[PDB]
Amino acid sequence: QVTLDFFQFKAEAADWFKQAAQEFEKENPDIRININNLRTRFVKDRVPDVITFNGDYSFGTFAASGVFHDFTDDPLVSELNEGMVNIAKNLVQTSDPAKKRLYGLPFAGNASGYIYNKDLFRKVGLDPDNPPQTWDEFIAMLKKFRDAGINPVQATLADAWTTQAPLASLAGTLVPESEYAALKSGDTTFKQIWTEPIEKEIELFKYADSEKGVTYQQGTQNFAKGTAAIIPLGTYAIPQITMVNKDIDLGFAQMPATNDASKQILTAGDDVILTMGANSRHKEQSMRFIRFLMSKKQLENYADAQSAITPLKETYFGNKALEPVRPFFESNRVADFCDHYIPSSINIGGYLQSAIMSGNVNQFIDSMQNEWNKVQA
C-alpha cells in the first residue's frame, strides 16, 4: 500500500482529475492518490510523484534542472502527436542540443485566439461558422457589435496572466519563433518584434466597453451570461464558461493579426504535460497511474470535458466549438506561445496589464528589453 502525491496545476480541471484518480483507486487497491490542486514544493526530498504542469518556460527550467523523470524512450511516446512531443522537448531550457530530451508526456493541447457567442453573431447577421479572416475584418466585427449595442470584448485584466493570451495569439502570426534566437543573440530587439503585437492588443481592448479590471472568473461569468460578443482567451477557458451556462452556443476562432488572409497562424501549445518526479520513491505505481491517464479513453474523456485537443497521432477535438480552427491544425499552420521564450523572472503579465491600461508602448518595450538584457548577461 502506497500513497502518491499528485500535484495538479490546472484549476479548471480539478474535478476531472479528482474523479479520474478515484476511478484508478477503485481498480488499484494498492495505490492511494492524494491530490494537491513552486521550487519549494519541488525540492527532491518532497517532490510530488505525479505532476501536471503547463507546457511553458517554467516547465522547461524544471526539466533542465532534473526535477522530472526522463520519458524519452518510454513506450507511450510513439502513439503521440510528434509535434506536441517536439514542443515539450524544445521547451527544455538548455543551450545543448543533446539535452532537449522529453521530461513529460503531452496530455492535452490548447489554442489561443478568441471565444465568441454564436447567438450574438447571428443577432448582428454574422456567420458564426466563418469568423473574420483578417485584422481589418476582425476590427470591423468589433465595431459592428458596439454599433448594435453589444459589448464587443470582455477583458479580465485583474488576472494578469489573461493579458498574455491576445499577445500570444497575435504574435503567432506576426513573429516567427526564430526571432527569439535572434533576440537572445542581440540581432533583434523587442522594439522590432513586439511593437506591432502590443499596438494591436491595445487596439483590441479599446473595444472592451465594460470595466476592464475584472477577474478571470468574473469575465467568464459575464460572457456565459451573454453580455459580450467575444472573450479573447484560449481553449482552456471554454469549460469555465460552460460550467456557468450549459446552453451558451460558443465558437472558437483564430485572432487574425494581419490583412494577409493566406498567411494566418494559430498559436497552439501543450496545455498539460503529465510527468513524474525524478526522485519519486514510488515510480512503478506512479507510472501505472500515468499509463491509465494516457489511454485513448481517458484522453478523449478529458478532451470532451475540457474542450481540449488530444495528444494522440489521430487528433481528437473535444468540442465542436473548435471547428473554425481545425484547418490550422490540419495544415500545420501553428506556432508555440511567444511567452514560452520569456524567462519566468520577467513580469510580462504585470507589464502587459500596464500597457493595456495606459497605452504606453514605449514603457512596455523598454521594460521587456531591459529585463531581458540583464537575464542574458
Ligand X SMILES: OC[C@H]1O[C@H](OC[C@H]2O[C@H](O[C@]3(CO)O[C@H](CO)[C@@H](O)[C@@H]3O)[C@H](O)[C@@H](O)[C@@H]2O)[C@H](O)[C@@H](O)[C@H]1O
- Residue 313 interacting with Cl ion (CB under 5 A): yes
- The partner in contact with residue 254, picked from Mg ion, Cl ion, ligand X, none with C-beta cut-offs of 5 to 8 angstroms by kind, is none
Cβ-Cβ contacts under 8 Å for 75 (sequence gap 6 or more): none
- Residue 179 interacting with Mg ion (CB under 5 A): no
- Judged by beta carbon, residue 121 or residue 351, the one nearer ligand X is 351
Write down the least CB distance from residue 30 to ligand X, Å: 31
Cβ-Cβ contacts under 8 Å for 37 (sequence gap 6 or more): 8, 11, 14
- Judged by beta carbon, residue 28 or residue 344, the one nearer ligand X is 344
- Residue 136 interacting with Mg ion (CB under 5 A): yes
Alpha helix (H) residue ranges in 106-211: 118-123, 135-148, 164-174, 178-185, 190-205
- Quote helix, strand, coil % in the chain, to nearest 5: 50, 15, 35
Residues 81-120 that bind Cl ion (CB under 5 A): 81-82
- Residue 336 interacting with Mg ion (CB under 5 A): no
The pairing of beta strand 31-36 with beta strand 2-8: parallel
Query: Which residues form the interface with ligand X (CB under 6 A)?
Result: 9-12, 54, 56, 112, 161, 164-165, 168, 234, 236, 269, 271, 337, 339-340
- The partner in contact with residue 325, picked from ligand X, Mg ion, Cl ion, none with C-beta cut-offs of 5 to 8 angstroms by kind, is none
Select from 76-84, 121-129, 172-180, 182-190 the region that touches Mg ion (CB under 5 A). 172-180
Distance (Å, whole) CA 117 – CA 120? 5
- Judged by beta carbon, residue 14 or residue 140, the one nearer ligand X is 14
Q: Could you identify the residue written with the cell 498567411? A: 263
- Residue 5 interacting with Mg ion (CB under 5 A): yes
- Judged by beta carbon, residue 121 or residue 329, the one nearer ligand X is 329
Closest residue to Mg ion in the complex (CB): 5
Q: Which three cell numbers stand for residue 55?
A: 507546457
- Judged by beta carbon, residue 173 or residue 285, the one nearer ligand X is 173
- Residue 317 interacting with Cl ion (CB under 5 A): yes
- Judged by beta carbon, residue 55 or residue 219, the one nearer Cl ion is 55
Specify the length of the chain in residues: 377
The string over 197-215, giving b where at least 16 C-beta atoms fall within 10 Å of a residue's C-beta and e elsewhere, is bbebbbbbbebbbeebebe
- Judged by beta carbon, residue 7 or residue 121, the one nearer ligand X is 7
Distance (Å, whole) CA 198 – CA 167? 7
Select from 3-11, 226-234, 301-309, 321-329 the region that touches Mg ion (CB under 5 A). 3-11
- Judged by beta carbon, residue 232 or residue 234, the one nearer Cl ion is 234
Residues 217-276 that bind Cl ion (CB under 5 A): none
- Residue 329 interacting with Cl ion (CB under 5 A): no
Distance (Å, whole) CA 166 – CA 242? 21
- The partner in contact with residue 317, picked from Cl ion, ligand X, Mg ion, none with C-beta cut-offs of 5 to 8 angstroms by kind, is Cl ion
Give me Rg for the CA atoms of the chain: 21
Backbone φ/ψ region at 98: left (φ over 0), alpha (ψ -120 to 50), beta: alpha
Write down the least CB distance from residue 104 to Cl ion, Å: 18
Q: Could you identify the residue written with the cell 457589435? A: 145
For 9, counting Cβ atoms within 10 Å of its Cβ (0-12 exposed, 13-18 middle, 19+ buried), the class is middle
Distance (Å, whole) CA 182 – CA 198? 19
- Applying CB under 5 A, the residues found at the interface with Cl ion are 81-82, 313, 316-317
Contact residues: Mg ion, CB under 5 A: 5, 136, 176-177, 335
